[PDB]
Design a protein around this ligand. Structure first.
Ligand code: F3S
Ligand code: F3S
Length: 104
């Protein structure tokens, strides 16, 4: 899977959502989140992010290493809807991301 990390927080450019063939990038209040059970490693999202927030799981930097679990935790109550388009923005951000001070 690919992973959205800290640079997305309170930026949310949303260039990435255009590119994903399976529509598995979902919007929270603070950032977007890649569904790890829906992502099939197409990689089309990663080049388009203007703040380089997106990484393949194995390439997520140590300083943001907790963001992979955060992406999974976003879907605790959503399950696997099988497409972000119908869900829209939801207030499902995990505690760890909710607690970050305002950025940008
Ligand atoms: S800021 Fe976020 S919303 Fe997508 S284009 Fe970059 S990951
Ligand atoms: S384009 Fe979609 S399939 Fe995964 S690698 Fe990016 S979220």
């Amino acid at each position: 899977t690919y992973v959205i990390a800290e640079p997305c927080v309170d930026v949310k450019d949303k260039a990435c959502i255009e590119e994903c063939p399976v529509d598995c990038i979902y919007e929270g209040a603070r950032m977007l989140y890649i569904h790890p059970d829906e992502c099939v490693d197409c990689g089309a999202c990663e080049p388009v992010c203007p703040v380089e927030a997106i990484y393949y799981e194995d390439d997520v930097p140590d300083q943001w290493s907790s963001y992979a679990q955060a992406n999974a935790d976003f879907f605790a109550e959503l399950g696997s809807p099988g497409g972000a388009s119908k869900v829209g923005q939801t207030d499902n951000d995990p505690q760890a991301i909710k607690d970050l001070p305002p950025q940008g």
